[PDB]
Write a protein that binds this ligand. Structure first.
Ligand SMILES: O=P([O-])([O-])O[C@@H]1[C@H](O)[C@H](O)[C@@H](O)[C@H](O)[C@H]1O
Ligand SMILES: O=P([O-])([O-])O[C@@H]1[C@H](O)[C@H](O)[C@@H](O)[C@H](O)[C@H]1O
Ligand SMILES: [Ca+2]
Ligand SMILES: [Ca+2]
Ligand SMILES: [Ca+2]
Ligand SMILES: [Ca+2]
Ligand SMILES: [Ca+2]
Ligand SMILES: [Ca+2]
Ligand SMILES: [Cl-]
Ligand SMILES: [Cl-]
Lengths: 272, 272
């Protein structure tokens, strides 16, 4: 797998420069399922680049990509080596030139993530992790924080892609409960992968969100765990790559305290 | 005033050095008005260093410093050349190693801001702006976005320092109104100065918040305006550096719209 991983990094840095060059220019913004669900030509171009370059070196491997799924593909995970890709995580940020956009790649064999590569191109941070090998950012080994007291934690989360009054009110309600525990604060950088990568570095204590997809957490999840953290479903149950929900914390203590506070929003699984 | 400005940029970098060095070490985290209102020995020393270095060259100038005010000094602005200082804007981030901390310095004469210096030490970004000279970040001229459609804007704001149910509910409700207009999204990096600087670059279209202090925005405000932006009061009226309220936008079109949507949160002015 090291051959594939080293290849993924080269590919990530490559797709990374395409994105980071495109960000400097005027874009043609297009909508997908709503006026806030955006996509551009770069999202599509980069994804086709990645898939081709991968199936060119590894023709037997399967692929699960955000735009490919929107192109007609089904997001079904088998035991076969599968590349779970998100060409640009932070499309809205990308469109606005907000300094946080990443290229995310996850690789799963036997339905388990072997390695994850997350490239934050604007800042030039390459986050990588291989099962049992550790998590790193530009050669620097990562380690999650040791905070076990919720009232002294810094959390990260996003408001979501939905504008439905009920869904929104529930998200804000969950945000309120945690906020008033209280915790030191809540941050929102604009991308699931980076938010999680910040938890891995220890700059944030935990991340939680409902509404995400497999391509959002496939690369960063392994990075949090290899940094010493834990992944979990919002329900307190085990993490599920297709569940649309996740809690990426420094330790099990915060994860369960957070789970205890938030109310689940009904979501449709990616494998349905 | 240019001499003062040149001296300011130097002092800010020197302070930035100190802050960014301490951020990697063990620190004594103390409390101010509550368990979530923090301060560290670095906040205290950096301010003392700044005020002393300034008082040496310009002994006839006045100062307004967060920690000085906390120590008993009153935040009263006069027509005399006053240095409005925020040693560390983003103390909670500092304590958590969250990659966004800034040293802010605002210089006012006749109660108007002449220049501002904001140094984001972790990123090594020096934001500066003299009235009528333009705003720059590391020697590159800044310019706000041109979005006049609120439904395509990206806003930045913070949840605040209060955990009072009543207040937290107004903050989240104001957030709910803007989010469901809808807007493309809402971000929170954890520091008012940087949030405003991101608006000056165009990465975000507008920033708003009620609860900040004069030292939080004295430096970044001139950067937004010099970048082509506008500072406004939540009432839609002119900006009042001592009111605890602010709307820093790319243009008046968006600013007026935000002021229309949000509800005022009762607060004690800095001059009361
Ligand atoms: O659309 P995308 O920009 O690839 O990814 C989005 C980002 O990860 C965002 O932070 C998260 O809150 C959304 O749920 C995702 O869909
Ligand atoms: O305490 P400080 O970190 O210097 O300043 C705070 C930060 O700027 C924060 O982002 C803002 O939301 C608060 O209102 C400020 O008081
Ligand atoms: Ca998307
Ligand atoms: Ca994407
Ligand atoms: Ca994504
Ligand atoms: Ca403070
Ligand atoms: Ca401060
Ligand atoms: Ca501050
Ligand atoms: Cl905070
Ligand atoms: Cl958002």
């Amino acid at each position: 797998w090291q051959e594939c991983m080293d290849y993924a990094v080269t590919l990530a840095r490559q797709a990374g420069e395409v994105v980071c060059e495109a960000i400097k220019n005027e874009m043609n913004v297009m909508l997908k399922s709503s006026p806030v669900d955006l996509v551009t030509a770069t999202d599509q171009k980069v994804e086709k680049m990645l898939i081709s370059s991968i199936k060119e070196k590894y023709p037997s491997h399967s692929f699960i990509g955000e735009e490919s799924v929107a192109a007609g593909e089904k997001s079904i995970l088998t035991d076969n080596p599968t590349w779970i890709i998100d060409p640009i995580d932070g499309t809205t940020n990308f469109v606005h030139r907000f300094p946080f956009v990443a290229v995310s790649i996850g690789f799963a064999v036997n339905k388990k993530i072997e390695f994850g590569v997350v490239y934050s191109c604007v800042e030039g941070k390459m986050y990588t992790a291989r099962k049992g090998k550790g998590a790193f950012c530009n050669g620097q080994k990562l380690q999650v924080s040791q905070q076990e007291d919720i009232t002294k934690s810094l959390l990260v989360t996003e408001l979501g892609s939905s504008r439905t009054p009920e869904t929104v009110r529930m998200v804000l309600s969950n945000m309120e409960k945690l906020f008033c525990i209280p915790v030191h604060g809540i941050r929102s950088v604009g991308t699931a992968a980076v938010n999680m990568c910040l938890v891995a570095t220890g700059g944030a204590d935990a991340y939680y969100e409902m509404g995400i997809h497999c391509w959002d957490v496939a690369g960063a999840g392994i990075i949090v765990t290899e940094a010493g953290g834990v992944l979990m479903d919002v329900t307190g149950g085990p993490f599920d790559l297709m569940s649309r929900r996740v809690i990426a914390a420094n330790n099990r203590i915060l994860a369960e305290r957070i789970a205890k506070e938030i109310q689940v929003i009904p979501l449709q699984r990616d494998d349905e």
